[PDB]
Design a protein around this ligand. Structure first.
Ligand code: HEB
Length: 123
Protein backbone atom coordinates (compact mmCIF):
# COMPACT_ATOMS: atom_id res chain seq x y z
CA UNK A 1 0.00 0.00 0.00
CA UNK A 2 1.17 3.51 -0.84
CA UNK A 3 1.77 6.52 1.39
CA UNK A 4 -1.63 7.92 0.43
CA UNK A 5 -3.34 4.62 1.23
CA UNK A 6 -1.57 4.14 4.57
CA UNK A 7 -2.23 7.70 5.80
CA UNK A 8 -5.82 7.68 4.44
CA UNK A 9 -5.91 10.27 1.75
CA UNK A 10 -4.51 13.51 0.39
CA UNK A 11 -5.50 15.73 3.36
CA UNK A 12 -3.64 13.40 5.74
CA UNK A 13 -0.55 13.30 3.51
CA UNK A 14 -0.51 17.12 3.27
CA UNK A 15 -0.79 17.52 7.05
CA UNK A 16 1.96 14.98 7.70
CA UNK A 17 4.31 16.53 5.16
CA UNK A 18 3.74 20.01 6.53
CA UNK A 19 4.44 18.89 10.10
CA UNK A 20 7.57 16.95 9.09
CA UNK A 21 8.78 19.96 7.06
CA UNK A 22 8.29 22.23 10.06
CA UNK A 23 10.26 19.96 12.40
CA UNK A 24 13.20 19.70 10.02
CA UNK A 25 13.19 23.47 9.38
CA UNK A 26 13.46 24.14 13.12
CA UNK A 27 16.07 21.43 13.82
CA UNK A 28 19.52 23.01 13.80
CA UNK A 29 21.05 19.55 13.30
CA UNK A 30 19.63 19.23 9.80
CA UNK A 31 18.00 22.45 8.57
CA UNK A 32 21.37 23.51 7.30
CA UNK A 33 21.42 20.83 4.58
CA UNK A 34 18.58 22.53 2.78
CA UNK A 35 20.52 25.78 2.12
CA UNK A 36 19.84 27.33 -1.28
CA UNK A 37 16.61 25.52 -1.87
CA UNK A 38 13.13 26.95 -1.75
CA UNK A 39 10.16 26.01 0.36
CA UNK A 40 8.51 23.82 -2.24
CA UNK A 41 11.77 21.87 -2.74
CA UNK A 42 12.12 21.29 0.98
CA UNK A 43 8.53 20.12 1.30
CA UNK A 44 9.04 17.85 -1.70
CA UNK A 45 12.11 16.32 -0.02
CA UNK A 46 10.29 15.66 3.21
CA UNK A 47 7.46 14.05 1.24
CA UNK A 48 9.98 11.88 -0.66
CA UNK A 49 11.77 10.87 2.57
CA UNK A 50 8.40 9.97 4.10
CA UNK A 51 7.37 8.05 0.94
CA UNK A 52 10.56 5.96 1.20
CA UNK A 53 9.94 5.36 4.91
CA UNK A 54 6.36 4.15 4.39
CA UNK A 55 7.72 1.49 1.98
CA UNK A 56 7.90 3.17 -1.44
CA UNK A 57 11.58 2.44 -1.71
CA UNK A 58 11.44 1.41 -5.38
CA UNK A 59 10.85 5.07 -6.18
CA UNK A 60 14.36 5.95 -4.94
CA UNK A 61 16.95 3.68 -6.56
CA UNK A 62 20.31 3.49 -4.79
CA UNK A 63 22.46 4.72 -7.67
CA UNK A 64 20.36 7.84 -7.95
CA UNK A 65 20.42 8.40 -4.20
CA UNK A 66 24.20 8.18 -4.12
CA UNK A 67 24.58 10.82 -6.78
CA UNK A 68 21.86 13.03 -5.28
CA UNK A 69 23.53 13.33 -1.90
CA UNK A 70 27.23 13.29 -2.89
CA UNK A 71 27.74 17.08 -2.57
CA UNK A 72 26.22 16.97 0.94
CA UNK A 73 28.56 14.23 2.00
CA UNK A 74 31.75 15.69 0.52
CA UNK A 75 31.12 19.40 1.04
CA UNK A 76 28.69 19.67 3.99
CA UNK A 77 29.79 16.83 6.27
CA UNK A 78 26.57 14.77 5.97
CA UNK A 79 26.88 11.66 8.13
CA UNK A 80 25.01 9.30 10.46
CA UNK A 81 24.05 11.82 13.15
CA UNK A 82 22.24 13.85 10.52
CA UNK A 83 20.48 10.88 8.97
CA UNK A 84 19.37 9.85 12.48
CA UNK A 85 18.03 13.36 13.19
CA UNK A 86 15.84 13.57 10.11
CA UNK A 87 14.55 10.04 10.77
CA UNK A 88 13.80 11.09 14.36
CA UNK A 89 11.82 14.09 13.13
CA UNK A 90 9.74 11.79 10.96
CA UNK A 91 8.96 9.43 13.79
CA UNK A 92 8.07 12.33 16.12
CA UNK A 93 5.77 13.74 13.43
CA UNK A 94 3.90 10.49 13.12
CA UNK A 95 3.61 10.07 16.90
CA UNK A 96 2.22 13.61 17.24
CA UNK A 97 -0.32 12.86 14.52
CA UNK A 98 -1.33 9.67 16.37
CA UNK A 99 -0.54 7.42 13.42
CA UNK A 100 -1.00 3.71 14.29
CA UNK A 101 1.90 2.15 16.14
CA UNK A 102 1.96 -0.66 13.56
CA UNK A 103 2.64 1.85 10.76
CA UNK A 104 5.19 3.70 12.87
CA UNK A 105 7.00 0.42 13.67
CA UNK A 106 7.20 -0.34 9.93
CA UNK A 107 8.50 3.20 9.22
CA UNK A 108 11.22 2.81 11.86
CA UNK A 109 12.31 -0.45 10.30
CA UNK A 110 12.34 0.78 6.68
CA UNK A 111 13.99 4.15 7.42
CA UNK A 112 16.67 2.05 9.14
CA UNK A 113 17.64 0.50 5.76
CA UNK A 114 21.40 -0.08 5.83
CA UNK A 115 21.65 0.14 2.09
CA UNK A 116 19.74 3.42 1.60
CA UNK A 117 21.82 4.92 4.38
CA UNK A 118 25.01 3.70 2.72
CA UNK A 119 23.92 5.12 -0.62
CA UNK A 120 22.84 8.51 0.77
CA UNK A 121 26.07 8.72 2.82
CA UNK A 122 28.15 7.64 -0.24
CA UNK A 123 29.92 4.76 1.44
C1 HEB B 1 16.54 8.36 2.51
C2 HEB B 1 15.19 8.05 3.13
C3 HEB B 1 16.41 9.53 1.57
C4 HEB B 1 15.60 9.66 0.46
C5 HEB B 1 14.63 8.67 -0.13
C6 HEB B 1 15.92 10.95 -0.10
C7 HEB B 1 15.42 11.38 -1.34
C8 HEB B 1 15.90 12.47 -2.06
C9 HEB B 1 15.49 12.77 -3.41
C10 HEB B 1 14.46 12.05 -4.18
C11 HEB B 1 16.31 13.87 -3.83
C12 HEB B 1 16.18 14.66 -5.13
C13 HEB B 1 16.81 13.84 -6.24
C14 HEB B 1 16.45 14.39 -7.63
O1 HEB B 1 15.64 15.33 -7.79
O2 HEB B 1 17.01 13.79 -8.59
C15 HEB B 1 17.09 14.14 -2.64
C16 HEB B 1 17.90 15.30 -2.56
C17 HEB B 1 18.39 15.86 -1.33
N1 HEB B 1 18.37 15.23 -0.15
FE1 HEB B 1 17.61 13.43 0.24
N2 HEB B 1 16.85 11.63 0.63
C18 HEB B 1 17.14 10.82 1.64
C19 HEB B 1 18.01 11.16 2.71
C20 HEB B 1 18.47 12.51 2.97
C21 HEB B 1 19.07 12.89 4.23
C22 HEB B 1 19.42 12.05 5.38
C23 HEB B 1 19.24 14.28 4.06
C24 HEB B 1 19.79 15.28 4.98
C25 HEB B 1 19.73 15.18 6.31
C26 HEB B 1 18.80 14.60 2.73
C27 HEB B 1 18.92 15.86 2.13
C28 HEB B 1 18.73 16.15 0.76
C29 HEB B 1 19.02 17.43 0.14
C30 HEB B 1 19.52 18.66 0.81
C31 HEB B 1 18.87 17.24 -1.25
C32 HEB B 1 19.08 18.22 -2.35
C33 HEB B 1 18.03 19.26 -2.35
C34 HEB B 1 16.77 18.72 -2.94
O3 HEB B 1 15.70 19.05 -2.40
O4 HEB B 1 16.81 18.12 -4.04
N3 HEB B 1 18.38 13.51 2.09
N4 HEB B 1 16.84 13.34 -1.63
Amino acid sequence: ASLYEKLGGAAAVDLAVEKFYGKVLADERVNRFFVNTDMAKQKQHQKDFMTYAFGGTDRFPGRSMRAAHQDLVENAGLTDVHFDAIAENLVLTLQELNVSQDLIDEVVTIVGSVQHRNDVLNR
